[PDB]
Write a protein that binds this DNA or RNA. Structure first.
Lengths: 119, 297, 98, 226
RNA sequence: CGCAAGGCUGAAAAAUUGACGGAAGGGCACCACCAGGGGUGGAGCCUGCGCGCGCGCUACACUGACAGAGCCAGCGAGUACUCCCUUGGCCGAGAGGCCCGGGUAAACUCUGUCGUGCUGAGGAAUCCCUAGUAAGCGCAAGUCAUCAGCUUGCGUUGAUUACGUCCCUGCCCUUUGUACACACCGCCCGUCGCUACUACCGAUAGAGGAAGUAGGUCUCCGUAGGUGAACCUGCGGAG
RNA sequence: GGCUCUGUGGGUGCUUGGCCGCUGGCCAGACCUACUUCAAAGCCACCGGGGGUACCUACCGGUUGGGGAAGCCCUAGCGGC
């Protein structure tokens, strides 16, 4: 913000900063350096952590339940399991955080929907 | 993947509402920037809004870049505007007749990066699924009355808008003899538009001209021999497909090769073809007191 | 999303690939390996119009051809190829009547 | 892309997920992709008709490899099983579920038994031998397996590291190493250091892939390439 | 309010970059070849478009008729939906309501009875089509434009033949650019325009016409001078 | 006879002793407080962002009164610069 407004490197790095933060899901928009000035927040990073983002994705009921689950090692993201409850899911991995392969949780969901394929 | 498309649609709509709020603000910030470089006195609420002063000192530069046109608006097309070649498929309705099949082939010839697919027994969610699976840019339906087309539904992908339009005064390619017509020249066509001034007209011009491949800009003003025209009068957009040769510096000869339509748009939905429950953007307001006096586009 | 690409240049020398390697007592390359000069003949010399002599021109194949020795038809055809490339990119009463 | 022109040739598509393994055929006529939409794709490019034959699997694809004599393909999926397909008639000709055959685990910071632990029970990378009869498979585990491709039995298993300083190199830890406050290889022991450059903890929180901090105490063992 | 708002006048270029091609070499195309399939075009019905033309619909027999038995779908729920119009009669002072007459599949499978019998599957041409595609089959809905002579959905049964080739018919692009290693390739061609210069031709220094070319360090000593013991400089000598 | 719980020992990594003022001793312990010539080299040492600085603190440059290490000189001293 402190650079003069007409400066090419200011504009390029503003668009770069906003694009990087929006792809990492901290911000909500990509058009306001003011939103970077008083919206980037340790609370925003904390809600981009794994148990709260799976709470929003409704994997678990509460954030405590999600932390207990992924400490038991039920939750992969992509193809690798995750045992650290501090993994920061970005906006491209939110579409891939799922359960692990032979999970008792996956079996219980399948048994609720009565589609339990035992093969 | 379908999770990703749903996520992007929700995030785009949320960013749209955020842009609505921020534009309601930035109408007031621009008076501050103009009053600064001029010295005309301004409103006291603008002058004493302290949060506006802090946020203004932060975000001068984006308003100035928008003034210089360096940046683009949050849109469904500005992501992939002229980098890729937007390929497009055309299908018919469930049971096509022979003249509708020939007409679909005619417009598949009109768009130089188009492919045609038979419907047969192809459920419409599976159609949208397959299009999002093979990264198609746009999809087109056609509805016949009896061998004569009556409706197009230009649907953009992955989650863009649809334009549902009714057709009239159509003449098909496949009625004139082959001795007079021939194989149509597949070249990257120019496009000319006439009569669009409103934001709705600009929206239609964008979602129409983003079906054609982008032209090489080094000698576009002189080369190229095929042009496609969209003119509107009383919001019934009429379109022809001409192919021309420039016999002089001050005269050109035309030759009409494609079909003629006067399509009238009766819906534009912010949401794709499968989403009948998508939020509409404009529909043909009939049965009102002045829906026939008002002229959109 | 990694980065937008930005032009970065790196200068290479004429020193051998055995000067490009890392520090070790004897090289892993043989006796043929060690004479490859890390730059091609195309870069150590390339005939081009900016490095021709005065009267002569260099052709597309890299053969110097003299403007004196060229016949007229060769000059005409070469001018045509250059043009094709460039295209691709009150008076007196007596003075009136007589 | 093509290598002699330098520009992008095309963008193949048809995958409902990220592609995760690729393989060209050694005769130079077939591409094979394998992607997290539980599918493999026999791409035929170099002919005049670019076609894509699909192969439906049960789970995510993690590795693809070709036999040297190019008629056979092997794909390793997320269940932990290898399925051997024939590239002419795209039919599965063999299969081995080697989850038990590769399961070796109990990393520290894991409250599952090494038997029940998921994430170490697959094959990350497989390769064919140069004869054409011995497949080699390696996953995120202590064991590298070496199967045969005709009899489909476990010819030989290897253990990659008897090193106890790495994490998952024995499948049963002991109550001597477990104290009252969690495992004794988990207490942050940086504080009793004499050098400030070793005392500073410039780690980033929740960074599974590499960070310049790289606390890196007891790294995981993983057979990342074979 | 002022300017705009006074008619040598009377309808049907640029170019040192430009105009048009030719030859070779590529790539693509059910508007191309190749193999097959299917329409329309024969008879009748009608919407539509300009008596004619197509688009759909129906009918036309081995793929048969009749009778039994068994067995399969999916999308669909606005206190809402009904095909008529009438002969009579009941109860209706009158307007009506009653009662009686007249005009969740198709398919498929299995099992038997009978036997080709106005009880005839579409010319020249032209168009389309390559995997849940052609084709057969019915059910639902009627969504501000279009559509009941129909339209759009939805399920069911589901093949033959290519999946190569630029030979024919075409379309596009290379012969300039846009990236460097290995590796290869090696000055495509024609007719003019425009420009600079050169001279020429003929009417009145002059506008046109026609044409071509583009290598003495160190130490010591003897000196002379400097600021003198010493110390510095220069020179001449020995190591 | 069975389920459940609870406790003890061994194992879950390749087998060289218990202790101390450890080249010797002790597991019953023994002796107890001596010995001494000259303080020290410097640097570095993680607090979230923008912002004020009256006070305190850090750093730099000074100012009055004392203070005199060290250096220099020679009339030699209670010296002189």
């Amino acid at each position: 913000s402190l650079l003069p407004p007409d400066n090419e490197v200011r504009r390029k790095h503003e668009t770069l900063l906003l694009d990087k933060l929006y792809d990492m899901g901290i911000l909500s928009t990509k058009a306001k350096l003011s939103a970077v000035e008083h919206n980037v927040t340790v609370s925003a990073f904390a809600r981009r952590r794994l148990p709260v983002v799976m709470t929003r994705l409704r994997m678990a009921e509460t954030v405590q339940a999600a932390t207990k689950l992924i400490e038991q090692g039920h939750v992969r993201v992509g193809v690798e399991e995750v045992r650290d409850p501090a993994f920061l899911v970005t906006r491209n991995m939110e579409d891939f955080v799922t359960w692990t392969v032979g999970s008792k949780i996956k079996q219980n969901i399948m048994k609720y929907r009565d589609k339990l394929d035992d093969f | 993947m379908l999770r990703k498309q749903a996520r992007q649609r929700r995030d785009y709509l949320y960013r749209r509402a955020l842009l609505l709020r921020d534009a309601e603000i930035a109408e007031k910030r621009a008076k501050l920037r103009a009053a600064l470089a001029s010295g005309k006195p301004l409103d006291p609420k603008i002058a004493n809004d302290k949060e506006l002063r802090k946020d203004f000192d932060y975000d001068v530069s984006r308003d100035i870049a928008k003034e210089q046109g360096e940046i683009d608006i949050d849109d469904e097309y500005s992501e992939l505007s002229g980098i890729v070649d937007p390929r497009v498929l055309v299908t018919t309705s469930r049971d096509p007749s022979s003249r509708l099949m020939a007409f679909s082939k005619e417009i598949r010839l009109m768009f130089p990066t188009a492919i045609r697919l038979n419907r047969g027994n192809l459920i419409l969610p599976d159609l949208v699924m397959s299009a999002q699976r093979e990264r198609l840019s746009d999809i087109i339906l056609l509805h016949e009355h009896r061998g004569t087309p009556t409706a197009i539904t230009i649907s953009h992908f992955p989650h863009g808008p649809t334009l549902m339009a009714s057709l009239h005064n159509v003449v098909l390619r496949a009625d004139i003899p082959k001795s007079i017509k021939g194989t149509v020249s597949e070249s990257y066509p120019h496009l000319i538009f006439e009569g669009f001034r409103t934001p709705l007209g600009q929206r239609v011009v964008k979602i129409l001209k983003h079906l054609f491949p982008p032209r090489d800009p080094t000698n576009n003003a002189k080369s190229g021999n095929r042009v496609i025209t969209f003119v509107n009068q009383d919001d019934c957009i009429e379109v022809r497909h001409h192919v021309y040769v420039r016999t002089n510096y001050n005269s050109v000869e035309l030759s009409e090769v494609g079909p003629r339509f006067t399509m009238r748009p009766f819906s534009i939905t912010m949401g794709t073809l499968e989403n009948k429950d998508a939020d509409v953007e404009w529909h043909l307001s009939q049965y009102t007191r002045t829906g026939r006096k008002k002229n959109y586009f | 999303k990694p980065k937008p690409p930005a032009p970065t240049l790196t200068v290479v020398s004429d020193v051998a690939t055995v000067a490009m390697e890392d520090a070790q007592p004897a090289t892993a390359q043989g006796v043929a390996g060690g004479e490859t000069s890390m730059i091609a003949p195309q870069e150590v010399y390339a005939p081009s119009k900016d490095t021709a002599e005065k009267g002569e021109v260099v052709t597309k194949a890299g053969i110097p051809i003299a403007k004196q020795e060229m016949s007229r038809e060769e000059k005409l055809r070469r001018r045509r190829r250059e043009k094709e490339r460039i295209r691709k990119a009150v008076q007196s009463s007596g003075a009136y009547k007589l | 892309w093509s290598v002699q022109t330098g520009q992008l040739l095309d963008r193949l598509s048809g995958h409902e997920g990220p592609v995760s393994s690729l393989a060209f055929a050694p005769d130079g006529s077939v591409l094979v992709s394998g992607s997290w939409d539980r599918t493999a794709r026999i791409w035929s490019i170099f002919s005049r008709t670019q076609t894509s034959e699909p192969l439906q699997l049960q789970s995510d694809v993690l590795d693809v490899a070709f036999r040297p004599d190019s008629k056979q393909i092997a794909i390793s999926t997320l269940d932990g099983q290898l399925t051997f397909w024939s590239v002419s008639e795209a039919q599965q000709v063999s299969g081995v579920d080697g989850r038990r055959d590769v399961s070796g685990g109990r990393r520290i910071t894991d409250r599952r038994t090494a038997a029940n632990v998921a994430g170490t029970k697959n094959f990350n990378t497989i390769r064919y031998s140069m004869d054409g009869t011995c497949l080699l498979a390696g996953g995120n585990s202590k064991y590298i397996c070496l199967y045969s491709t005709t009899t489909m039995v476990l010819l030989k298993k290897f253990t990659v590291s008897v090193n106890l300083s790495l994490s998952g190199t024995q499948e049963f830890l002991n109550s001597k190493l477990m104290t009252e406050a969690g495992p004794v290889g988990l207490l942050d022991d940086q504080g009793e250091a004499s050098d400030l450059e070793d005392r500073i903890d410039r780690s980033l929180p929740g960074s599974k892939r590499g960070d310049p901090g790289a606390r890196k105490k007891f790294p995981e063992v993983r057979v990342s390439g074979v």
